[PDB]
Each structure stands twice: as structure tokens, then as C-alpha cells.
């Protein structure tokens, strides 16, 4: 059928007009196939023969479908498409299972010839006119234009999805407890009624559907849940990711490790505590897809962990709207966070992981906060509601980190949970200078051409030291010089520096860094008992600024 629905007006982009592409000549039998096809289609309304006053043309080919010897008609809308207006993005964003409400009975119905079942806008049909070439191309070809939405045209998925929504509107409104999902030419029908009441409202959906040009699989064939969908396995009561088998190989290529890292990542939606840091380490570097990568001990270890985590099945529950979401996060490794989301412990609606580093340096507190944000947004999308959090951090630790920290921040209602490791701050810098502690006016420097550097310090107690570094930058020397001061000083030290770069880093109280230097400065800072870091304006001519500026 051709749905009786109204059409969507469409126009070519503002500059241009329809394509005018010459038809490549086709073998004598490809020509035969196209004629058979278009005669079929023509009798259905899908296409219409046209007088060659119509300027427009688009190429058309016919690939010999499968070994099953039938033919299929392909059209090339490359050019009409390039010249057609942009449409509202079909659906961008996809429903997560964990967001679905539980349902008693579910049915799939598939639309037939979906695209050819929806009308095309009159004023636009003209531009969809193709040509079936004559044998050895000696005479005028037959010419049709589309009446329905052609496959492969730019606006087809948009208009179709829209039409199907316009047609469903009535049913949905007169039945707000039954659930439909439209994914492309699929309709799934969800109900909390019994196998009879449900086949009932299903069968009059179909009736409503045929009243509008759309035919559906008879109540006799052929799909019952479980359903595979977008990678998932939905049952009426629970869901999971669809079966994922991890290979047993003695040799692992880059390509084999990618597909594994991506199957594990997929798994991690519902399988708690999946880790992949060690398998992803391999991929670092530049190597060919076929190059074999030998697994490290830590990576082989990980593969081990993951392999058992998967050995027994796991499923997620569905969402009861009248209960709070609970989100628990655990530290799982360095920069690695895992979380579960549930409503009755511990039957999870979903699990996840987080391992993004922001910047070169952070500490656990920063990272844990960034996962709370991640999880929160995710919550809003999936459930339209933020969860209540349980975090491995004491209220005091987090109250301390924030108040003193210079970026604004705020996490939703949360409460402590004792799930080790716990997040702490590993050192804290003095607020005022320390009486009775040696004062290091330190100072690093680099000659930008040589990239040769000299780092050093002088103290109020007469001490001095200047050492030499090779191919570093001003940045490194300034961090070296502070590192210097920390290894030579005792447990209470005052350090003065003219490096704002360095102050900023350290004042941020890092506890992980990409920089080895910094990771040491850190080691040192945890060993100390009091440390006060001060900044001074370089070259301005300051107490020990100029003094050890002599030494550099």
C-alpha cells in the first residue's frame, strides 16, 4: 500500500536544482532485470512512467543479489542527496535497557516495504526520475519517477519515522499504558496485560496500522522474546548484553586486542568490575593491525580476572519509577573507577566504569568527583533523575578538599560507604610559613636554544647547590629546583619559588602525574611533615630570588 498520510514538503538546498546525471550503459540482462522490477513496482504505485520533458536523471544499477539467483535494483542518489535539504536528525540518542520499565508481555511487529509505503512530496518527485537504458543504449530508455520514498535518498529515514509517529499518535494517546518503540522499520509492543488481552490490543494496533497503509506480520509468525537489539538481550523482566565469547588464542594481534577491549567495554554495562587498563596498555604505540602483541604479566593477569567475571551470566533489572536510584562507586585501580546503579541491593539496573584522566595531574578527590558528574548526567538521560550516591570518601576529607580548592564544585546528596581503597588526601601544604624551618629560595632555569638547564637553591642557613640538566625546559628546571629543595631539606621546610607554573601544579595537591619528576616531588611531599610553598615575582629583585638567580 501507499499510506494515505499527508506528505512532507521537501526542497533542494537553496542554491541548486535536481541532478542531471547520464546513465551508464548496462549489460543486456541487468537491463532485463530492471524492467521486470520496475513493472512490478509501477503496478503498486511506487513508481510512475514519465514523459522525457523531465530534465532530471539519476543513475541506476542492479547487483545480482546473492547466490540465490534473484536480482535487486539499486539507485545512486549520491547526487540528489548532495543537493537535498538537511532534515531533523532521525533519532539521535538511543534508549538504554536499564531505563525501561518492566513489562508483562512483549511483541515485535515488522513493517513491510516501509519506505515504499510512504508517499513522496509531489513537487519533489520530478527530481527522483531515473532511466532504464536501451540494449547497447541505441534508443531512449524508459523513464520512471518515484511516488514513494526511495531507499538511499537523504530524507527517507526522517520522513518515514515522522510518518510512523504521526500514525501511531492516535493509538498511543488512546492507550497510554501500552508501550511502542519505533526503531526504523521495527515496532515493538509492550504491555502489562495477559497473553489474551495483549494479543487483543496488538491485533487492533495492526488494524489501526492497515487502515494507514502499513502491513504487519500475522499473529502467527514469528517472534517471541528474548529479543536481540542493538547488542542487548531483552526479556520482559530482565535484560543483559548479548552473549560475548572471549577467544582462546596463543597469539594476539593488535586487531584481536581491539575487539577484546571493545567486547569487555561493552560487557562492563552489567558485568561489575571489568578492567582493561592493562590490555589497553598494549595498544599504546604505533603498530599494524596484524602485528602480534605479546601480553604483559599485568595484562595477562587482567585477561584472567575478566575471563572469570564473565564465566557466569549476569542480568540487569528494569526501572521502577517510584524508587530512588542508588549509585555506588569503587576505586578499582589507578585512575580506574567502577560503579553500580541499583534500587534494591544489589540487583543492579546497570554498572559502568570510568578511567578518564583530566589534565596531566589530579588526585583521587578530583577524579571521584568527575565520575559523580559522569554518572549523574548518565542518570538524567536514562531515568530523568539523579541518584543517591555512596562514595568511598569521608565527609571530612571531601569537605576539606573543596573549601580550600579554587574551582567551584558540588555533588548531589551522598553518604560515606566503607569500600576500600578509600580516597584520601596524601599530604596538605601549610597555610602560613613555618617558623624554625629552613627557607629554600629555589630556582630553575633553561637556555631556550641549548635547552641546557641549571637548577638550584640557597637557604637562610647558608646552604647552596646548583646542578645541571640537559635538554629540559624552563618548566622542568623550576620543578627540579623544588624537588631539589625537598630532598636536601628535613621534615619542616619553607620553599620560595618564582615559578607560577610549579606553584599551581603543586598547590593543586596532586597525587598522580604523567610527569616522573612530579610523581617524585609527590613522593617527597608525603614523606615531609610540614611544607610551605610561597611564590615571588621573578627578576623583580627579591631577597633570595636574585641571590640564587646568581647561581643559575
Binding residues for Mg(2+): 110, 185-186, 443, 478, 498, 549
Contact 299, 380 (CB under 8 A): no
Query: By CB under 8 A, is residue 414 in contact with another protein?
Result: no
Nearest residue (CB) to ligand T27, 236 versus 444: 236
Between residue 369 and residue 388, which ones bind another protein under the rule CB under 8 A? Answer: 369-370, 373-374, 376-377, 380-385
- DSSP letter for each residue of 306-372: HHHHTTS---EE---TTS--EEEEEEEETTEEEEEEEEETTEEEEEEEE----SSEE-HHHHHHHHH
Position 332 contacts another protein (CB under 8 A): no
Is residue 17 within 8 A of residue 115, CB to CB? The reply is: no
Count the residues of the shown chain that bind ligand T27, applying the rule CB under 6 A: 17
Instruction: Give the residue ranges of the annotated binding site.
Output: 110, 185-186, 443, 478, 498, 549
270 part of the interface to another protein, by CB under 8 A: no
Indicate whether 16 belongs to the interface with another protein (CB under 8 A): no
End-to-end CA distance of the chain: 86
In whole angstroms, how close is the CB of 344 to another protein at the nearest point?
20
The whole-angstrom separation of Cα 243 and Cα 398 is 41
* In the complex, least distance from residue 227 CB atom to ligand T27, rounded to whole angstroms: 3
Who contacts 76 (Cβ-Cβ below 8 Å, separation ≥6)?
A: 21, 58, 59, 60, 61, 152
The three grid cell numbers given for residue 96, joined into one nine-digit string: 538504554
Task: Report the nearest approach of another protein to the CB of residue 212 (Å).
Answer: 17
Rg of the chain (C-alpha set): 34
Asked if 202 interacts with ligand T27 (CB under 6 A), we say: no
Question: Pick from 64, 230, 534, 550: which binds another protein (CB under 8 A)?
Answer: 534
Minimal distance in Å, beta carbon 106 to ligand T27? 4
Q: Which does 540 bind (CB under 5 to 8 A by kind): another protein, ligand T27, none?
A: another protein
Nearest to ligand T27 of 189, 393 (CB atom): 189
- Rounded to a whole number of angstroms, the minimum distance from the CB of residue 94 to ligand T27 is 8
Q: 441 is in the binding site of which of ligand T27, another protein, none (Cβ under 5 to 8 A by kind)? A: another protein
**Partner that binds at residue 71, options another protein, ligand T27, none, CB closer than 5 to 8 Å by kind:** none
Site string for another protein, 206-245 (x = CB under 8 A): ----------------------------------------
With residue 388 as reference, give the H or E element that holds it.
strand 388-391
* Contact flags string 76-115 toward another protein, x per CB under 8 A: ---------xxxxxxxxxxxx--xx---------------
Within positions 88 to 127, which residues make up the interface with ligand T27, using CB under 6 A?
95, 100-103, 106
Contacts 24+ apart (CB under 8 A), 290-294: 290/253, 290/254, 290/255, 291/253, 291/254, 292/251, 292/252, 292/253, 292/254, 293/252, 293/253, 293/254, 293/257, 294/252
Q: Which stretch binds another protein (CB under 8 A): 19-27, 227-235, 299-307, 454-462?
A: 454-462
Q: Which residue is nearest to ligand T27 (CB)?
A: 227
Figure out which of the listed residues 215, 429, 532, 552 binds another protein, where binding follows CB under 8 A: 532
Q: Is 229 in the site for ligand T27 (CB under 6 A)?
A: yes
Residues for the chain: how many in total? 552
Q: Which of 362, 360, 505 is nearest to 426 (CA)?
A: 362
And the C-alpha cell for 181?
A: 518503540
User: C-alpha cell of 258?
Assistant: 581491539
Binding to another protein, residues 506-525 (CB under 8 A): 507
Cβ-based neighbours of 386, under 8 Å, separated by 6 or more: 325, 376, 379, 380, 412
232-265 burial string, b = 16+ CB within 10 Å, else e?
Answer: bbbebebbbbeeeeeeeeeebbbebbeebeebbe
- Taking the complex as a whole, how short is the minimal distance between the CB of residue 313 and ligand T27, in angstroms? 16
Residue 475 touching another protein (CB under 8 A): no
Picking from 63, 93, 92, the residue whose alpha carbon sits closest to that of residue 381 is 93
**Helix H or strand E segment including 91:** none
Contact residues for ligand T27 (CB under 6 A)? 95, 100-103, 106, 179, 181, 188, 190, 225, 227, 229, 234-236, 318
Amino acid at each position: 500500500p501507499i499510506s494515505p498520510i499527508e506528505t512532507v514538503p521537501v526542497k533542494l538546498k537553496p542554491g541548486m536544482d535536481g541532478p542531471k546525471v547520464k546513465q551508464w550503459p548496462l549489460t543486456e540482462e541487468k537491463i532485463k532485470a530492471l524492467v521486470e522490477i520496475c513493472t512490478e513496482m509501477e503496478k503498486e504505485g511506487k513508481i510512475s512512467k514519465i514523459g522525457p520533458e523531465n530534465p532530471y536523471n539519476t543513475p541506476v544499477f542492479a547487483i545480482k543479489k546473492k547466490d540465490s539467483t534473484k536480482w535487486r535494483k539499486l539507485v545512486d542518489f549520491r547526487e540528489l542527496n548532495k543537493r537535498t535539504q538537511d532534515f531533523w536528525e532521525v533519532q539521535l540518542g538511543i534508549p538504554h535497557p536499564a531505563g525501561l520499565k518492566k513489562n508483562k508481555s512483549v511483541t515485535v511487529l515488522d513493517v513491510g516495504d516501509a519506505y515504499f509505503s510512504v508517499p513522496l512530496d509531489e513537487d519533489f518527485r520530478k527530481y527522483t526520475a531515473f532511466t532504464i537504458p536501451s540494449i547497447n543504449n541505441e534508443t531512449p530508455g524508459i523513464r520512471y519517477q518515484y511516488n514513494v520514498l526511495p531507499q538511499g535518498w537523504k530524507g527517507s529515514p526522517a520522513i518515514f519515522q515522522s510518518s510512523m509517529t504521526k500514525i501511531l499518535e492516535p493509538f498511543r494517546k488512546q492507550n497510554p499504558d501500552i508501550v511502542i518503540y519505533q526503531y526504523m522499520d521495527d515496532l515493538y509492543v509492550g504491555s502489562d496485560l495477559e497473553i489474551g488481552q495483549h494479543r487483543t490490543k496488538i491485533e487492533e494496533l495492526r488494524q489501526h496500522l492497515l487502515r494507514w497503509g502499513l502491513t504487519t506480520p500475522d499473529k502467527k509468525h514469528q517472534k517471541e522474546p528474548p529479543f536481540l537489539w542493538m547488542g542487548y538481550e531483552l526479556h520482559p523482566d530482565k535484560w543483559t548484553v548479548q552473549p560475548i565469547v572471549l577467544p582462546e588464542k596463543d597469539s594476539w594481534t593488535v586487531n584481536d586486542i581491539q575487539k577484546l577491549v571493545g567486547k569487555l567495554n561493552w560487557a562492563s554495562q552489567i558485568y561489575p568490575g571489568i578492567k582493561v587498563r592493562q590490555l589497553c596498555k598494549l595498544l599504546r604505540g604505533t603498530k599494524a593491525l596484524t602485528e602480534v602483541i605479546p601480553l604483559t604479566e599485568e595484562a595477562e593477569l587482567e585477561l584472567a580476572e575478566n575471563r572469570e567475571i564473565l564465566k557466569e551470566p549476569v542480568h540487569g533489572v528494569y526501572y521502577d519509577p517510584s524508587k530512588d536510584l542508588i549509585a555506588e562507586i569503587q576505586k578499582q585501580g589507578q585512575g580506574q573507577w567502577t560503579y553500580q546503579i541499583y534500587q534494591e541491593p544489589f540487583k543492579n539496573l546497570k554498572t559502568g566504569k570510568y578511567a578518564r584522566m583530566r589534565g596531566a595531574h589530579t588526585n583521587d578527590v578530583k577524579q571521584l568527583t568527575e565520575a559523580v558528574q559522569k554518572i549523574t548526567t548518565e542518570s538524567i538521560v536514562i531515568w530523568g533523575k539523579t541518584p543517591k550516591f555512596k562514595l568511598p570518601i569521608q565527609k571530612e576529607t571531601w569537605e576539606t578538599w573543596w573549601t580550600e580548592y579554587w574551582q567551584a564544585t558540588w555533588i548531589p546528596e551522598w553518604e560515606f560507604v566503607n569500600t576500600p581503597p578509600l580516597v584520601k588526601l596524601w599530604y596538605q601544604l601549610e597555610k602560613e610559613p613555618i617558623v624554625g624551618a629552613e627557607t629554600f629560595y629555589v630556582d630553575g632555569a633553561a637556555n631556550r636554544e641549548t635547552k641546557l638547564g641549571k637548577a638550584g637553591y640557597v637557604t637562610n642557613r647558608g646552604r647552596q647547590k646548583v646542578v645541571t640538566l640537559t635538554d629540559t625546559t624552563n618548566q622542568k628546571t623550576e620543578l627540579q629546583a623544588i624537588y631539589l629543595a625537598l630532598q636536601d631539606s628535613g621534615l619542616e621546610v619553607n620553599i620560595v619559588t618564582d615559578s607560577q607554573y610549579a606553584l599551581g601544579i603543586i598547590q593543586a595537591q596532586p597525587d598522580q602525574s604523567e610527569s616522573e619528576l612530579v610523581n617524585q616531588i609527590i613522593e617527597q611531599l608525603i614523606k615531609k611533615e610540614k611544607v610551605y610553598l610561597a611564590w615571588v615575582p621573578a627578576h623583580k629583585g627579591i631577597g633570595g630570588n636574585e641571590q640564587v638567580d646568581k647561581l643559575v
